[PDB]
């Protein structure tokens, strides 16, 4: 059974390969294609890239700061409007499973100000079937070079995070795009990547029974058998 | 090139040999599976399907009825709060087509008093690259028997609708699922459907030159080519 880790090098080929010249907010250019989705398993694994070296620690102490609630992401995850977001998806989990509202949504911080009612920007949807949670991430945007690679990291943890204070094991992680974007100055970079050939998923370990989200600490949690590619700097 | 429609065959079929039993909040029976998407070119084409009869006229009736704004859907596309989320949508793809924020959403109405800001329910995010509109509709969850070929018509539908006000031609749809099911007691019809070969989907004309949104009306579309299998009653 196929490697998960080839949905995305086959997304950054297809891109490569079709996607169309599109600029961003800023005028820097890109190449995009809109809808892109891949799936994850977080069972006995997890997503954490290897054709190249995933900065694990920023996306953990990042995730970490992001549950906090401090200042922004966080504060809209924990004081939305507050509602918190993210202990109402945990409640509702303990609560209903079958629940298909089970979601939480994230706002470019930008976008408050600039009118009434802006769209979100990112949604995550929770699933629980058979005692396993899977989580989906839908993002307007995806930087395939270097926010994507980092965001399955993230998100595979949180669902990680939440199943370990429900009592759930993780099910799948699936990423889905919007405009799904490669800039212009990564091409070459993810070229060279796409030559490397992908090494088994880690495992991520979880050190200690931790019963509400807030208490979690970078220490409760540790990478095992990730053996990555060489860092691309992009 | 491969049939759009072998898309939600291969969805129905995954489904039925993959899919889990999950119950829904009235405790009926179904298949899951989370996390599902697909992509319909509009290109020279429309993705009516053909291994049943899709009821048309009410795909068409029932859209233009939601873009009045009668009551509901409508209320909130162009009331929301309000903030007429469609012509925003509309605004925004003439001013600044290379948005990544062209996000309209849809709330069940049962959710509304049940608590406070309460999660979406469907989002339809749009698209323009090289003159062409894509819009992509994510819905919390998809009823594959029923709901799901009604809805391929009729955001379809929308997505020419805005093509044809902004001047942009149809690209694709995409729609992307959160927990995609099929109910018991449709299991036995689906089987007999994905027995069927897709035919050639139809074109879809519209005969007038229409400038605002709220100008269309039924005569306005004709559907040519469609000749689909006998209709299957779920």
């Given at each position: ?15 490569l ?8 907010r ?7 294609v ?7 398993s977080?069972?006995?694994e ?18 970490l ?10 504060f ?9 977001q993210?202990?109402?998806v ?12 089970i ?17 979100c ?6 699933y ?6 899977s ?10 070079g ?14 990680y ?17 919007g ?34 989200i807030?208490?979690?600490k970078?220490?409760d949690?540790?990478?095992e ?10």
């Amino acid at each position: 059974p196929p490697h998960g880790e080839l949905q995305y090098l086959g997304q950054i080929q297809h891109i490569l390969r079709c996607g169309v010249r599109k600029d961003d907010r800023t005028g820097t250019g890109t190449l995009s294609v809109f809808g892109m989705q891949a799936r994850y398993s977080l069972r006995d694994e997890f997503p954490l890239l290897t054709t190249k070296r995933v900065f694990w620690k920023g996306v953990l102490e990042e995730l970490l700061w992001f549950i906090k609630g401090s200042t922004v992401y966080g504060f809209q995850w924990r004081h939305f409007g507050g509602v918190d977001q993210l202990q109402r998806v945990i409640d509702t989990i303990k609560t209903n499973p079958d629940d298909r509202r089970i979601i939480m949504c994230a706002w470019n911080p930008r976008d408050l100000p600039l009118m009434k009612l802006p769209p979100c920007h990112a949604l995550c949807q929770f699933y629980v079937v058979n005692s396993e949670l899977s989580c989906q991430l839908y993002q307007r945007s995806g930087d395939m070079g270097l926010g994507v690679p980092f965001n399955i990291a993230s998100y595979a943890l949180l669902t990680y995070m939440i199943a370990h204070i429900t009592g759930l094991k993780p099910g799948d992680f699936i990423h889905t795009l919007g405009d799904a974007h490669i800039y212009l100055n990564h091409i070459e970079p993810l070229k060279i990547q796409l030559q490397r050939e992908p090494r088994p998923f880690p495992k991520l370990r979880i050190l200690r029974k931790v019963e509400k989200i807030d208490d979690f600490k970078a220490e409760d949690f540790q990478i095992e058998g990730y053996n990555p590619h060489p860092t691309i700097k992009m």
